[PDB]
Structure formats: structure tokens, C-alpha cells
């Protein structure tokens, strides 16, 4: 089935919030590659993070990753208007046919 994301999160500008990603160890013990995706409204997905804490190309420092075995956490600090977007957690492992995709969470800045 699908990973668990809370539908929506909210926070004040400049602060930090975390989006959680639960159920990672539901299917097998294979090493869980954890990925994160940003999508602005009307835009396509853009890859944010791989390997729970590994930043990708142009992603600033404000994005960080952590993990608790079955729950991953993507934290964003110094909240700003650009960050308002839809986020998707995903996990892949060897033998998978498709990587498991989260339900997505809308992040809004107050």
C-alpha cells in the first residue's frame, strides 16, 4: 500500500517544520532508499532529496533529512513563500517494481 503522510502542514515564515513519512519498513527489510519531491501548483514534480539526508542539485541548506527506522522526516528551516508546495515522500528498494509513493502533503506558510 501507500506510505503515510499527513495531508497538510503549516508554519510561520522563518521557522522550521518537518513532514513525516511513516510505514517505510512495512514491506521487507531491504535497504530503504528514501526520496522526496517538490511540486509547485501547476508545475511538475522536482526531485528534492535522496538517501534520506542527501541533498540534490540546487536544494539549499534549509532542507534536511532524518529517519527513525519506519518514519522519515524532511525538515525545512527558514520558511519562506517559495516553500509553499506539494511534497511527496517515496521509498525504493531492490526487487521493487515501482517505488512506493506517499499520499503527499501540502505545505503552506502563514
Amino acid at each position: 500500500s501507500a506510505l503515510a503522510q499527513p495531508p497538510s502542514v503549516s508554519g510561520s515564515p522563518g521557522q522550521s517544520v518537518t513532514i513525516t513519512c511513516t510505514g517505510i519498513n512495512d514491506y521487507g527489510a531491504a535497504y530503504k532508499f528514501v526520496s522526496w519531491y517538490q511540486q509547485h501548483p501547476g508545475k511538475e514534480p522536482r526531485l528534492i532529496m535522496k538517501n534520506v539526508k542527501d541533498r540534490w542539485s540546487v536544494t539549499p541548506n534549509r532542507f534536511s533529512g532524518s529517519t527513525s527506522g519506519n518514519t522519515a522526516s524532511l525538515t525545512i528551516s527558514n520558511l519562506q513563500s517559495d516553500d509553499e508546495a506539494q511534497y511527496f515522500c517515496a521509498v525504493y528498494a531492490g526487487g521493487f517494481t515501482f517505488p512506493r509513493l506517499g499520499g503527499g502533503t501540502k505545505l503552506s506558510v502563514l
Binding site: 532508499f33 526520496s35 511538475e44 514534480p45 522536482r46 526531485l47 535522496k50 511527496f88 517515496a90 525504493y92 531492490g94 517494481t97 515501482f98 517505488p99 509513493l101 499520499g103 503527499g104
Partner: protein, 125 residues
């Protein structure tokens, strides 16, 4: 690298449509490719996958109805869709994935790095 899409459009239930996905900077025929769809206001969902070897896996909900084929002269893939249903309405995406499978066996995985802008498909009566 870039991907560019065309096709899609309007169809009655049971009709047929077709979407092209062409690449630049690299050839489709030697990479891992994915077809996904997203219904309006909803989340992404898998549709089809073609490996570097060219064998294709379909999700059950479209097996027997959707078919992907390589267009090597155009350096593209084609999603042909027949027996269209209402549920098939949404925006479709063709995407490229980068992985590392050394001597067959895998060790490293990036994810989906290249994403087409998507084509709109509307099945209506």
C-alpha cells in the same frame, strides 16, 4: 537531457488516444523509463515501466488496454491507449530514472531526474 511530449487530448469512453515522449541528450532505448498519471487535484500514480532491456510492465488497471512502444527513429516512446475509461482522465507524464545495477546486481539509486511537462487527457461523454 530533456523530455518533450505530445498527443493526448479529448476522447469518448472506449475511444483511443496516443501520447509521444521524445528525448534529447540521451536515447530512450538504453535507459529506465516510466509512465505516470495524475488525476486533477489528486496524487501521482504509476502506469507503465520500460527497462533498459525494453521489456515493459503494466499496472493491472490498464493491462490489455495500454501499450507502450519504442520509436527509435524518433528517439521516443509512444503510449497508445485503447478502451478508454472515465478513470483514465488526467495529466500524463513521461520520466527518466537513473539507477546503478553493477553487473546486473544493484547498489545505488537516484530516482526520477528528468520529467516531461505532461499531456492532458480528458475522457468524457
Amino acid at each position: 537531457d530533456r523530455l518533450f511530449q505530445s498527443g493526448g487530448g479529448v476522447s469518448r469512453p472506449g475511444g483511443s488516444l496516443r501520447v509521444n515522449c521524445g528525448a534529447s541528450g540521451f536515447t530512450v532505448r538504453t535507459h529506465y523509463m516510466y509512465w505516470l498519471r495524475q488525476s486533477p487535484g489528486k496524487g501521482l500514480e504509476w502506469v507503465a515501466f520500460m527497462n533498459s532491456g525494453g521489456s515493459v510492465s503494466y499496472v493491472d488497471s490498464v493491462r490489455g488496454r495500454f501499450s507502450v512502444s519504442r520509436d527509435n527513429p524518433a528517439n521516443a516512446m509512444v503510449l497508445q491507449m485503447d478502451a478508454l475509461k472515465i478513470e483514465d482522465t488526467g495529466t500524463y507524464y513521461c520520466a527518466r530514472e537513473l539507477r546503478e545495477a553493477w553487473y546486473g546486481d544493484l547498489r545505488d539509486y537516484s530516482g526520477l531526474d528528468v520529467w516531461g511537462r505532461g499531456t492532458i487527457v480528458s475522457i468524457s461523454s
